[PDB]
Write a protein that binds this ligand. Structure first.
Ligand code: CLA
Ligand code: CLA
Ligand code: CLA
Ligand SMILES: CC(C)=CCC/C(C)=C\CC/C(C)=C\CC/C(C)=C\CC/C(C)=C\CC/C(C)=C\CC/C(C)=C\CC/C(C)=C\CC/C(C)=C\CC1=CC(=O)C(C)=C(C)C1=O
Ligand SMILES: CCCCCCCCCCCCCCCCCC(=O)OC[C@H](CO[C@@H]1O[C@H](CO)[C@H](O)[C@H](O)[C@H]1O)OC(=O)CCCCCCCCCCCCCCCCC
Ligand SMILES: CCCCCCCCCCCCCCCCCC(=O)OC[C@H](CO[C@@H]1O[C@H](CO)[C@H](O)[C@H](O)[C@H]1O)OC(=O)CCCCCCCCCCCCCCCCC
Ligand SMILES: CCCCCCCCCCCCCCCCCC(=O)OC[C@H](CO[C@@H]1O[C@H](CO)[C@H](O)[C@H](O)[C@H]1O)OC(=O)CCCCCCCCCCCCCCCCC
Ligand SMILES: CCCCCCCCCCCCCCCC(=O)OC[C@H](CO[C@H]1O[C@H](CS(=O)(=O)O)[C@@H](O)[C@H](O)[C@H]1O)OC(=O)CCCCCCCCCCCCCCC
Ligand SMILES: CC1=C(/C=C/C(C)=C/C=C/C(C)=C/C=C/C=C(C)/C=C/C=C(C)/C=C/C2=C(C)CCCC2(C)C)C(C)(C)CCC1
Ligand SMILES: CC1=C(/C=C/C(C)=C/C=C/C(C)=C/C=C/C=C(C)/C=C/C=C(C)/C=C/C2=C(C)CCCC2(C)C)C(C)(C)CCC1
Ligand SMILES: CC1=C(/C=C/C(C)=C/C=C/C(C)=C/C=C/C=C(C)/C=C/C=C(C)/C=C/C2=C(C)CCCC2(C)C)C(C)(C)CCC1
Ligand SMILES: CCCCCCCCCCCCO[C@@H]1O[C@H](CO)[C@@H](O[C@H]2O[C@H](CO)[C@@H](O)[C@H](O)[C@H]2O)[C@H](O)[C@H]1O
Ligand code: OEC
Ligand SMILES: [Cl-]
Ligand SMILES: [Fe+2]
Lengths: 335, 32, 50, 34, 51, 37, 82, 34, 28, 340, 32, 35, 51, 51, 35, 65, 37, 34, 37
C-alpha cells in the first residue's frame, strides 16, 4: 500500500470512475440519497400535516387519498416557524410526521446536495482540463431552489410558507404569491419569463438553423443522424450557410457568424434571466413587491378610472380573501 | 389500485434510469 | 436502415401496395363505423325522445 | 465628418432625457394617483 | 363493406406489380397525377350532383 | 336589394383591389427599370 | 458582406445628414407634440378628456350593448355631456 | 376510492402497447447479422 | 425650481474632459 | 416576361430581403405593430371595457393595451366599413375595431413571415427546419387569439394586446379554467422550461469545452468563420456529462434536432389544451376527490385548497371583468375566509 | 390544428426534396 | 463607391423612424396633462 | 429594513456568482487551460474509456 | 357544386397542366398531392368544427 | 431518540472531515498539466 | 409487369405521365377562378358573420320551419 | 411471385428504445391521474 | 353486469404480455441477415 | 471487457408465432369468463 489515505484520495478524485464521485461528491451523494429516500417514502405513505399550525392537517400522500398531480410533501408547521426540527426534536415519529418533519429533512438535504452538485460540476471540469463556469450556469436553477425553499421562508419567518413538494402544491405557492406580492407586475419576474421564453425561442432557433444546415452524407432512406460520427475532426454543419440564411431572414448584421459568440449568447440569456427571477423571489421574500398602480389614473372630478391593473387587483383580492381560511384572526396579513 | 399503478410506473422509470446509464451503447470514437 | 417514423415510405413509389394500404385503411374506417353503431344500438334507449 | 463616439454619447443622453421625462410624468401627469 | 375492402387489400398487396402502374416509355413505375385528379374530381362531382 | 351593408362590402372590395393595384402597379414598373445580367 | 446601400456609419457621420436632420427630427417631434397639446388627438380617436368619462352626477359606464346600433348608441352616450 | 373503473386498463394499455412496439423493433434491430 | 441647469453642466463635463483630449490628441 | 422581371427585382439580395413573401409580410407586419403602437398611446377602452388603456389617458407601458371589442360585437370582424363602424374611423376605434385590426393583420403577417422562411431557405438552398419550428408560435397565436374566443361568446374574452391585459388573462384561466391543472399545459411548460434548459446547458457546455485556437484570454476572436475543425471538444463534453449526470450526448446532429423538438412540441401541446378551453372542455376537477370531500369534511389536499382560490378569483373579479353581465354581488354573498 | 403541421411538413418535404439529407459546398451569399 | 440615396432600406428605415419620433413627441407632451 | 435587505441580498448573491467565476478561472489559469483545451495533448483522450 | 365538379373534372382529363405549374408544384411527385389534400382536409375540418 | 442524534452527528462529522482533509491533501496538484 | 383484363382497359387513362402544356398554359385563366373563389368565400363568410346583411337572408335558427 | 424490390430493413437503436420508454412512462405518469379521475 | 372489475385488465394483460413476447422474438428472428 | 463466448442467437419461426398466438388467444377465450366471474 502506497498509503491508504493517499489511495483513498486518488480513488475519490479518479476520473476513471463511471460516475465522478468528487470531494463535493463525498457530501452530495449521502445528502442526495437521504433526501430522495425520505421524499419517496413521504410522498407515498406520509400522514396528513398541520401546515398552518392551526390543527388542520393536510394530507398529501398517495396512500392517504392523493394521486400524482395532487399529492405532495407538505411543509413543516407554522407553529415551528424557522425553528430547527430534526427527528430527535420530537417525542415520537408520530409527532414528527404531524408537524411536517420530513419536509425540513428533505429541503435541507437537497439544497446541501444540490449545492455540492454545483461544486462537483467545477471539480470534474478541473480534473478534465476544461474551462469552469459550467457550474456558473447551474447557479441559476440552484439559486431558484434556494429562493423558493429557503430564502422566502427565512424572509416570511416560517418554513410553512416555503413551496410544497408537489404539483398542485406548487400551484398554491404561486397563486398565493401573486396575491400577496403581485409578482406578475414585478420587473425581476418579467425578466425571468423573458429568459425562459427567449431560451425556448433561441433553443428552437439554434436547434433548427443547425439541423437545417447539415452537410449531406446520408442516403435518401437513411437517418440524417448517421451522417455524424462520435469524435469528428471537422464540423458536421455549414455554419456559413446557416448565417447566410438567418442573415437574410432579418438582416446580415443581426445574425451570428461566430459560433463562440453564438453559444455564449445561448448560455448568457437564460442564465441571466433566471438569475433575476431567482432574485425576484428572494427580493419579494422581504415584501418589496411589484408595481402598485391601483387607482392611479383618475378623472377630473376624482372618480377612479380603472385599468387592467385594477382588474388584476380584483383577481388578487379573491386569492387573498380566500387563502388560508381559518388561519387569520386580524385585519392585516403581515405573515 | 391507483396507488399501485402510480408507484409501478415510477419504479419503472427508475429502472429505466439504471439501464440507460449503466447499460447504454458504449460511445465509440472515430471508427464508428 | 429505416427509422420507425419512416416505415411507410416503402410505398412512395409502389402504386399497388399503396392502393392495398388505402384499401386496408378504408376497411378499418368502414369497420369502425359499422361496429361503433352496433355499440350504440346495444346501449341507446329509445323509450323517451323528449 | 462627425466622430461616431460623439454621435452616440449625444443621442445617448438624449434618450436618457426623454425617458427620464417619462418617469417624471409617472409622478405628475394623469398616470399619477393624486 | 369492410370485409370486402380487406380481401381487396390483400389481392393488391400480393399482385402489386400490375403493368398499369408501369410507364410504357420509361418502363418504370409511374402515376399520371394530373389526369387522375381529373378522373376522381369528375366522379366526385357526379356523385355530389346525385346526392 | 343592395342593402347598406352590401354597399359597404363593395366599398371594401373596391378599396382592396386598388391597394392590390397600386402595389403591383408600382412593383411591375420599378422591377422593369434595373435587373441587368 | 456588402450590398448597394450606403453604409450607415458614413451617413450618420456625414455633416450633410445632420444639416438635414437637425431640421427634420425636431420637426416631427414638435408636430406630435402639437397633435396632443392642441387636443386634436382626443377627437381623432374619440378618447375621453379627463372631464369626459362620466356625467356630473352619473357614475355608470357607457357600455356598448348591441353591435348594429352601436355607433348610434355611442353618439347617445356623448349626448349626456359625457 | 371513487375512481374510474377503466382508468386502470387505460393506463395499462397506454404503457404496454407503445412500449411493446419499441422493444419489438429494438430486439429485431439488435439481431440483424453484421 | 429648475436645478436641471446643474446636471446639464456636470453631465457634459464628463465627455468634455475626454473631448478636449481628442483635440489635444494624447493618452486615450 | 414581366413576371420573371418582377421576380428578378423582388429576389434581389438587398439589405432587407423583400421577396414574394414580402408582398404579404411587410404590409401586415407593419400595420399590426403600427396599430398596436397607435392604440397604445391614443385609443381608449372606455366604451368597450370601462377602462383607460392609453398613454393619453395616463396609462404606463405596463397598463396600456389595445383592448378587445365589446361582448355585444360578438365574433364580428369589425371592418372599418362594416355595419358597426359604418366607415367612421373614430367610432371604429371606440368600438375596439383596432383589436380585430391587429389580430387579423398580425395573423397574415405570421403567415407571410413563415413563407419568407420557406422562400429564403429555398433560395439559399438550405433545409426548411426553420419553418417547421416556427409552426409552434403560429399554433399558439391561432389557438389563443382566434380559436379560443371563437369558442366563447365573443372576441371580448380573447387576450387584449398589452402587458397587464395579459396578466389578467393568466389569472382568468386560473380562476375559471383551472388551467394549471391541465395536462396539456403542463407539457407546455415542460417544453418551454426544458427548452430554456437546453439553451442554457448547451451554450455553457460549448463555451467551457472549447479548444485553444488563440493566445488571448478572450477566446472569441480565436474562432474560424470558415468551418474546418470543431471549435469545441465534443469528446470531452461527452465524458463530462457522462460522469456528472450519467447521460450525455454524442451526436451533434441529434443534439440539435432535440433542441428543436422539445420547445416546439411543448408549445403545440399547450395549444391543444387551449383549443379545449374554447369549448370550456377544461381539466377543472377530479371527481374522485370531490366525492370524498363532500362526504368527508376533514379531507383536505392542495388540490381542494386551489379550488377555493378559484372561487374567490371568480367572485371578486367577475363584476368589473365582465361589465356586460351587469353583475351585482352583495357583500354578504362574497366568499371570504376569517378576518380577511 | 394538428393537420396544419402535417401540411407544412409534407409541403416542405416536397419543395425541398433535393436539399433533404443535407447540403453541399460553395460559398456565395452576400453578393448577387 | 458611388452609393445611391433613396433606396428600399431608406424606405423601411423611415416607415419606423418617422412615426416613432412623432410618437415620442406626442407622449412627451402627455407628461404635462392634468386635472 | 425592506430596502436594505433586498438590495444587499442581490449584491451578496451576485458576489457569490463572481466568486465561483473568479475561483474557477484562477484554478484553470494556474494549471493553465483557462483559454481552451490543447488540441494536441487533449487530456480526455489519454484516459481509459468508461463506456 | 356537383355540376361545376363534373365540368372541372372533364377539364383536367383533357387540358394538361402548364409547364410552369408542373415544375412549380412538383407534380408527378405523389407527395405533393398529399401536401395539398391535407391542406384541404384541415380546411374542411375547421369548417365542420365551426358549423 | 437521544441516541439517533449522536449517531447522525458522528456520521455528519465523518463526511465533513473527509471533505476538509480532502481538498487539503494537495488538491490543486490533481489536474492535467501545471501542478 | 402483369397485364390483366381490367388493366388493359385502364391502360390509356394512365400513360400521359410527364405530358405538360407549354409555357404558362392555362395559368392566367385559372388565376381568375381563383380570385372569384376568394371573393365567393369572403361573401358567405361575411354573411355567416353578419358583417354582410341582406334582407331576405336571416342568419338565425329562424327563417326555418 | 417476384420479391418486391421496394422494401428496406427497419432499425431502432438502443438509445431510441430508452428515449422512447422514457417518453411513454412519464406520459403514463402524467395522464394516469386523469384517467382514474 | 355484476362482473369482476379486474377481469378486464387481467384478460388484457393475459393476451398482450405473452403475445408481445412472441412477436418480439419472431420479428427479431425475421430480421437476421442471411 | 471480453465478449462473453457463451451466447447464442435466439429464434422463433413464423409458424411458432402462429401456434403461440393460437394458444394464448384460446386460453384467454377460455379463462376470461372466469376472470370476470
Ligand atoms: C357505398 C358507400 C357508402 C354509403 C352510402 C355510406 C353511408 C353512410 N355512412 Mg359511410 N363509409 C363508406 C361508404 C359508404 N357509407 C366507406 C367506404 C367508409 C370508409 C372510409 C365509410 C366510413 C364512414 C364513417 C366513419 C361514418 C360513415 C357514416 C355513414 C352514414 C352517414 C354519412 C354522412 O353523414 O356523410 C358524411 C359526409 C361527408 C363526410 C361529406 C364528405 C365531403 C368532402 C368533405 C368533400 C371532399 C372534397 C371534394 C373532393 C371536393 C371536390 C368536390 C366537387 C363537387 C367540388 C351513412 C349511412 C357515419 C355514420 O353514421 O356511421 C354509420 C360515420 O360516422 N361512413
Ligand atoms: C396585401 C396586403 C394586405 C392584406 C392581405 C390585408 C388584409 C386585410 N385588411 Mg388590410 N391594409 C393593407 C394591406 C393588406 N391588408 C394596407 C397596405 C393598408 C393601408 C392602406 C391596409 C388597411 C386596412 C384597413 C384600414 C382595414 C384593413 C382590413 C383588412 C382585413 C379585411 C379586408 C377585407 O375585407 O379584404 C377584402 C378583400 C379584397 C378586396 C380582395 C379582392 C381581390 C379580388 C381578386 C379583386 C376583385 C375586385 C372586383 C371588383 C370584384 C368583382 C366581383 C363582382 C361581383 C363585383 C384583412 C385581414 C380591415 C380590418 O382589419 O378589419 C378589422 C380594415 O378595416 N386593411
Ligand atoms: C393525410 C394524412 C397523412 C398521411 C397519408 C401521411 C403520410 C406520411 N407521413 Mg405524415 N403527418 C400527418 C398526416 C399524414 N401523413 C399529420 C397530420 C402530421 C402532423 C402531426 C404528420 C407528420 C409527419 C412527420 C413529422 C413525418 C410524417 C411522415 C410521413 C410518411 C411516412 C409515414 C410513416 O412511416 O409513419 C409511420 C408512423 C408510425 C409507425 C408511428 C405512428 C404512431 C402514431 C403517432 C400513434 C397514433 C396511431 C393512431 C392509430 C392514429 C389514428 C389516426 C387518426 C388520424 C384518427 C408518410 C408519407 C414522415 C416522413 O416524411 O418520413 C421522412 C415523418 O417524418 N408525417
Ligand atoms: C420592403 C418594403 C416594401 C419596405 C417596408 C418595410 C417595412 C414597413 C417593414 C416593417 C416590418 C416590421 C413592422 C417589423 C418586423 C419585425 C422585426 C423587426 C423582427 C424582429 C427581429 C429582431 C429585431 C430580433 C432578432 C433577434 C436576435 C437577437 C437573433 C437571435 C439569434 C439566435 C440566438 C439564433 C441562433 C443562431 C444564429 C445564427 O446566426 C447562426 C449562424 C446559427 C447557427 C444559430 O444557431
Ligand atoms: C426605429 C426603432 C423604433 C422601433 C419601435 C418598436 C417598438 C418598441 C417598443 C415601444 C415601447 C414604448 C414604451 C413607451 O411608449 O412608454 C411610454 C411611457 C409613457 O409614460 C406615461 O405617460 C403618461 C402620460 O399621461 C402617464 O403620465 C404615465 O404616468 C407615464 O408612465 O413611458 C413609461 O413610463 C414607460 C417607460 C418606458 C419603458 C419601456 C420598456 C419597454 C421594454 C420592452 C421592450 C419590448 C420587448
Ligand atoms: C425586417 C427587418 C427590418 C429592418 C429595418 C431596418 C433596420 C435598420 C437597422 C440598422 C442597424 C444596423 O444596420 O447595424 C448597425 C451596426 C452595423 O454596422 C454596419 O457597419 C457596416 C460596415 O460596413 C455598414 O456600415 C452598415 O451600414 C452599418 O450599419 O450594428 C451591428 O453590428 C449589429 C446590429 C444588430 C442589431 C440587432 C438588433 C438589436 C438592437 C439592440 C436594441 C436593444 C437595446
Ligand atoms: C447523479 C445521477 C442522477 C441520475 C440522472 C438520471 C438521468 C435520466 C436518464 C434518462 C434516460 C436517457 C436516455 O433515454 O437517452 C440517452 C441519450 C444518450 O444517447 C444519445 O443517443 C442519441 C441517439 O443516437 C444520440 O446519439 C446522442 O448523441 C446520444 O448521446 O440521451 C439523449 O440523447 C437525450 C438527452 C435527454 C435526456 C433526458 C433527460 C432526462 C430527464 C428525466 C426526466 C424524467 C423524470 C421522471 C421522474 C419520475
Ligand atoms: C452512512 C454511511 C453509508 C456508507 C455506505 C456504504 C458504502 C457505500 C457502498 C456503495 C454500494 C453501492 C455501489 C454502487 C456502484 C456504483 O454506483 O457504480 C459503480 C462505479 C464503479 O466504480 C467503483 O467500482 C470499482 C470496483 S468494480 O468495478 O465495481 O468491481 C472500484 O474499483 C472503484 O473504486 C469504484 O469507483 O462507481 C462509481 O462510478 C463511483 C461513483 C459512485 C456514485 C454513488 C452514487 C451517486 C449518487 C448521487 C446521488 C443520487 C441521488 C439519488 C439518485 C436516485
Ligand atoms: C372479412 C369478412 C367478413 C367480416 C368482416 C368483419 C367482421 C369486419 C369487422 C371489422 C371491424 C370490427 C373493424 C373495427 C375497426 C375499429 C377501429 C379501426 C377502431 C379504431 C379506434 C381508434 C383508432 C381509437 C383511437 C383513440 C383512442 C384509442 C383513445 C384516444 C382517442 C382516439 C380516438 C384517438 C364478412 C363475414 C363480413 C364477409 C367478408 C369476409
Ligand atoms: C448609449 C451608448 C453610448 C453612450 C453613452 C453615454 C451617453 C454616456 C454618457 C456619459 C456621461 C454623461 C458621463 C458624465 C460624467 C460626468 C461626471 C463624471 C462629472 C463629475 C463631476 C463631479 C464629480 C463634480 C461635481 C461638483 C460640481 C460640478 C459642483 C458641485 C460640487 C462638485 C465639485 C461635487 C456609447 C457611446 C458608450 C456607446 C454605446 C451606446
Ligand atoms: C392604426 C392604423 C393605421 C396605422 C398607422 C401606423 C402604422 C402607425 C405607426 C405608428 C408607429 C410605427 C409608431 C411607433 C412608435 C414607437 C415608439 C413610441 C417607440 C418608443 C420606444 C421607446 C420608448 C424605447 C424605449 C427603450 C427600449 C424599449 C430599449 C431600452 C432603452 C429604451 C428606454 C430606449 C393606418 C393609418 C395604416 C390605418 C388605420 C389604422
Ligand atoms: C388588401 C385590402 C386593403 C383594403 C384597405 C382599405 C382601407 C380604406 O378603407 C376605407 O376607408 C375609408 C375612410 O378612409 C372608408 O370611407 C368611409 O368614410 C368616409 C369618410 O371618411 C365616407 O365618405 C365613406 O362613405 C365611408 O365608406 C371606406 O368605407 C373604407 O373602405
Ligand atoms: Mn401559507 Ca404568506 Mn397569506 Mn400570511 Mn400565510
Ligand atoms: Cl391555500
Ligand atoms: Fe450548438
Amino acid at each position: 500500500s502506497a498509503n491508504l489515505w493517499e489511495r483513498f484520495c486518488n480513488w475519490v478524485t479518479s476520473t476513471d470512475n463511471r460516475l465522478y464521485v468528487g470531494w463535493f461528491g463525498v457530501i452530495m451523494i449521502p445528502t442526495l440519497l437521504a433526501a430522495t429516500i425520505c421524499f419517496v417514502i413521504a410522498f407515498i405513505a406520509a400522514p396528513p400535516v398541520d401546515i398552518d399550525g392551526i390543527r388542520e392537517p393536510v394530507s398529501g400522500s398517495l396512500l392517504y387519498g392523493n394521486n400524482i398531480i395532487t399529492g405532495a410533501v407538505v411543509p413543516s408547521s407554522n407553529a415551528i416557524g424557522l425553528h430547527f426540527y430534526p427527528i430527535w426534536e420530537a417525542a415520537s415519529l408520530d409527532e414528527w410526521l404531524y408537524n411536517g418533519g420530513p419536509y425540513q429533512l428533505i429541503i435541507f438535504h437537497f439544497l446541501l446536495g444540490a449545492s455540492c452538485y454545483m461544486g462537483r460540476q467545477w471539480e470534474l471540469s478541473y480534473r478534465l482540463g476544461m474551462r469552469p463556469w459550467i457550474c456558473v450556469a447551474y447557479s441559476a436553477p440552484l439559486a431558484s431552489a434556494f429562493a423558493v425553499f429557503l430564502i422566502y421562508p427565512i424572509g416570511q419567518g416560517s418554513f410553512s410558507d416555503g413551496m410544497p413538494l408537489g404539483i398542485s402544491g406548487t400551484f398554491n405557492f404561486m397563486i398565493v404569491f401573486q396575491a400577496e406580492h403581485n409578482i406578475l407586475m414585478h420587473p425581476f419576474h418579467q425578466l425571468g419569463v423573458a429568459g425562459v421564453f427567449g431560451g425556448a425561442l433561441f433553443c428552437a432557433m439554434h436547434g433548427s438553423l443547425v439541423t437545417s444546415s447539415l452537410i449531406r452524407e446520408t442516403t435518401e432512406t437513411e437517418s440524417a443522424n448517421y451522417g455524424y460520427k462520435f469524435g469528428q475532426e471537422e464540423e458536421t454543419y455549414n455554419i456559413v450557410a446557416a448565417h447566410g440564411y438567418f442573415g437574410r431572414l432579418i438582416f446580415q448584421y443581426a445574425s451570428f457568424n461566430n459560433s463562440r459568440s453564438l453559444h455564449f449568447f445561448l448560455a448568457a440569456w437564460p442564465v441571466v434571466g433566471v438569475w433575476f427571477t431567482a432574485l425576484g423571489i428572494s427580493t419579494m421574500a422581504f415584501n418589496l413587491n411589484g408595481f402598485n398602480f391601483n387607482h392611479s389614473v383618475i378623472d377630473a372630478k376624482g372618480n377612479v378610472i380603472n385599468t387592467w391593473a385594477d382588474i388584476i387587483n380584483r383577481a388578487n383580492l379573491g386569492m387573498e380573501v380566500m387563502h388560508e381560511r381559518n388561519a387569520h384572526n386580524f385585519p392585516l396579513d403581515l405573515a | 389500485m391507483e396507488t399501485i399503478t402510480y408507484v409501478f410506473i415510477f419504479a419503472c422509470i427508475i429502472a429505466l434510469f439504471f439501464f440507460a446509464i449503466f447499460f447504454r451503447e458504449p460511445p465509440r470514437i472515430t471508427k464508428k | 436502415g429505416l427509422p420507425w417514423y419512416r416505415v411507410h415510405t416503402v410505398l412512395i413509389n409502389d402504386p399497388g401496395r399503396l392502393i392495398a394500404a388505402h384499401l386496408m385503411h378504408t376497411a378499418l374506417v368502414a369497420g369502425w363505423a359499422g361496429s361503433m353503431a352496433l355499440y350504440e344500438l346495444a346501449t341507446f334507449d329509445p323509450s323517451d325522445p323528449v | 465628418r462627425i466622430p461616431l463616439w460623439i454621435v452616440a454619447t449625444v443621442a445617448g443622453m438624449g434618450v436618457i432625457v426623454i425617458v427620464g421625462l417619462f418617469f417624471y410624468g409617472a409622478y405628475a401627469g394623469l398616470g399619477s394617483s393624486l | 363493406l369492410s370485409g370486402l375492402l380487406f380481401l381487396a387489400a390483400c389481392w393488391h398487396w400480393v399482385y402489386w406489380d400490375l403493368e398499369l402502374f408501369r410507364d410504357p416509355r420509361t418502363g418504370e413505375p409511374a402515376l399520371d397525377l394530373p389526369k387522375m385528379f381529373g378522373i376522381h374530381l369528375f366522379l366526385a362531382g357526379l356523385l355530389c350532383f346525385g346526392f | 336589394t343592395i342593402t347598406p351593408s352590401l354597399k359597404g362590402f363593395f366599398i371594401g372590395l373596391l378599396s382592396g383591389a386598388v391597394v392590390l393595384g397600386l402595389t403591383f402597379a408600382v412593383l411591375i414598373a420599378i422591377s422593369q427599370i434595373d435587373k441587368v445580367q | 458582406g456588402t450590398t448597394g446601400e450606403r453604409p450607415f456609419s458614413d451617413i450618420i457621420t456625414s455633416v450633410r445628414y445632420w444639416v438635414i436632420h437637425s431640421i427634420t427630427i425636431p420637426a416631427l417631434f414638435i408636430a406630435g407634440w402639437l397633435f396632443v397639446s392642441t387636443g386634436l388627438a382626443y377627437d381623432v380617436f374619440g378618447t375621453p378628456r379627463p372631464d369626459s368619462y362620466y356625467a356630473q352626477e352619473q357614475r355608470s359606464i357607457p357600455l356598448v350593448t348591441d353591435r348594429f346600433e352601436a355607433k348610434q348608441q355611442v353618439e347617445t352616450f356623448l349626448e349626456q355631456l359625457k | 376510492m371513487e375512481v374510474n373503473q377503466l382508468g386502470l386498463i387505460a393506463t395499462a394499455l397506454f404503457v404496454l402497447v407503445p412500449s411493446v412496439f419499441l422493444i419489438i423493433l429494438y430486439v429485431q434491430t439488435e439481431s440483424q447479422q453484421k | 425650481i429648475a436645478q436641471l441647469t446643474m446636471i446639464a453642466m456636470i453631465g457634459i463635463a464628463g465627455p468634455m474632459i475626454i473631448f478636449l483630449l481628442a483635440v489635444r490628441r494624447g493618452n486615450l | 416576361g414581366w413576371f420573371d422581371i418582377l421576380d428578378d427585382w423582388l429576389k434581389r439580395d438587398r439589405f432587407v430581403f423583400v421577396g414574394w413573401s414580402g408582398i404579404l409580410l411587410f404590409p401586415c407586419a407593419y400595420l399590426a405593430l403600427g396599430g398596436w403602437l397607435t392604440g397604445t398611446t391614443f385609443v381608449t377602452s372606455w366604451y368597450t371595457h370601462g377602462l383607460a388603456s392609453s398613454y393619453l389617458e395616463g396609462c404606463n407601458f405596463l397598463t396600456v393595451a389595445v383592448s378587445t371589442p365589446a361582448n355585444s360585437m360578438g365574433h364580428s370582424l369589425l371592418l372599418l366599413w362594416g355595419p358597426e363602424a359604418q366607415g367612421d374611423f373614430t367610432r371604429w376605434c371606440q368600438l375596439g375595431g383596432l383589436w380585430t385590426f391587429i389580430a387579423l393583420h398580425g395573423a397574415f403577417g405570421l403567415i407571410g413571415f413563415m413563407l419568407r422562411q420557406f422562400e429564403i431557405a429555398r433560395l439559399v438552398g438550405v433545409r426548411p427546419y426553420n419553418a417547421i419550428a416556427f409552426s409552434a408560435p403560429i399554433a399558439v397565436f391561432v389557438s389563443v387569439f382566434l380559436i379560443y374566443p371563437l369558442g366563447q361568446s365573443s372576441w371580448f374574452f380573447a387576450p387584449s394586446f398589452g402587458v397587464a391585459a395579459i396578466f389578467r388573462f393568466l389569472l382568468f384561466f386560473q380562476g375559471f379554467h383551472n388551467w394549471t391543472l391541465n395536462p396539456f399545459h403542463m407539457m407546455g411548460v415542460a417544453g418551454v422550461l426544458g427548452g430554456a434548459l437546453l439553451c442554457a446547458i448547451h451554450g455553457a457546455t460549448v463555451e467551457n469545452t472549447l479548444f485553444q485556437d488563440g493566445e488571448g484570454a478572450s477566446t472569441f476572436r480565436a474562432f474560424n468563420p470558415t468551418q474546418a475543425e470543431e471549435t469545441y471538444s465534443m469528446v470531452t463534453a461527452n465524458r463530462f456529462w457522462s460522469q456528472i449526470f450519467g447521460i450525455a450526448f454524442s451526436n451533434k446532429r441529434w443534439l440539435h434536432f432535440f433542441m428543436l423538438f422539445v420547445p416546439v412540441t411543448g408549445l403545440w401541446m399547450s395549444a391543444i389544451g387551449v383549443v379545449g378551453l374554447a369549448l370550456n372542455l377544461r381539466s377543472y376537477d377530479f371527481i374522485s376527490q370531490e366525492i370524498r370531500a363532500a362526504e368527508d369534511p376533514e379531507f383536505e389536499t392542495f388540490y381542494t385548497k386551489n379550488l377555493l382560490l378559484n372561487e374567490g378569483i371568480r367572485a371578486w373579479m367577475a363584476p368589473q371583468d365582465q361589465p356586460h353581465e351587469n353583475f351585482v354581488f352583495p357583500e354578504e354573498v362574497l366568499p371570504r375566509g376569517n378576518a380577511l | 390544428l394538428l393537420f396544419f403541421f402535417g401540411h407544412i411538413w409534407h409541403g416542405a418535404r416536397t419543395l425541398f426534396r433535393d436539399v433533404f439529407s443535407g447540403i453541399d459546398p460553395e460559398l456565395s451569399p452576400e453578393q448577387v | 463607391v458611388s452609393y445611391p440615396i433613396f433606396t428600399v432600406r431608406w424606405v423601411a428605415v423611415h416607415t419606423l423612424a418617422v412615426p416613432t419620433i412623432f410618437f415620442l413627441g406626442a407622449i412627451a407632451a402627455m407628461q404635462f396633462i392634468q386635472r | 429594513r425592506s430596502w436594505l435587505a433586498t438590495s444587499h441580498f442581490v449584491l451578496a448573491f451576485f458576489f457569490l456568482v463572481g466568486h465561483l467565476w473568479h475561483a474557477g478561472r484562477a484554478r484553470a489559469a494556474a494549471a493553465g487551460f483557462e483559454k481552451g483545451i490543447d488540441r494536441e495533448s487533449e487530456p480526455v483522450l489519454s484516459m481509459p474509456s468508461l463506456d | 357544386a356537383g355540376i361545376v365538379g363534373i365540368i372541372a373534372g372533364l377539364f383536367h382529363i383533357l387540358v394538361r397542366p402548364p409547364q410552369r405549374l408542373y415544375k412549380a408544384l412538383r407534380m408527378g411527385n405523389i407527395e405533393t398531392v398529399l401536401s395539398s389534400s391535407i391542406a384541404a382536409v384541415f380546411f374542411a375540418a375547421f369548417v365542420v368544427a365551426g358549423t | 431518540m437521544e441516541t439517533l442524534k449522536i449517531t447522525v452527528y458522528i456520521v455528519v462529522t465523518f463526511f465533513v472531515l473527509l471533505f476538509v482533509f480532502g481538498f487539503l491533501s494537495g488538491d490543486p496538484a490533481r489536474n492535467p498539466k501545471r501542478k | 409487369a402483369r397485364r390483366t383484363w381490367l388493366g388493359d382497359i385502364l391502360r390509356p387513362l394512365n400513360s400521359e405521365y410527364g405530358k405538360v402544356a407549354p409555357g404558362w398554359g392555362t395559368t392566367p385563366l385559372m388565376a381568375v377562378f381563383m380570385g372569384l373563389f376568394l371573393v365567393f368565400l369572403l361573401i358567405i363568410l361575411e354573411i355567416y358573420n353578419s358583417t354582410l346583411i341582406l334582407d331576405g337572408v336571416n342568419v338565425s335558427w329562424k327563417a326555418l320551419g | 411471385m417476384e420479391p418486391n424490390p421496394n422494401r428496406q430493413p427497419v432499425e431502432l437503436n438502443r438509445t431510441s428504445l430508452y428515449l422512447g420508454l422514457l417518453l411513454i412512462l412519464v406520459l403514463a405518469l402524467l395522464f394516469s391521474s386523469y384517467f382514474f379521475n
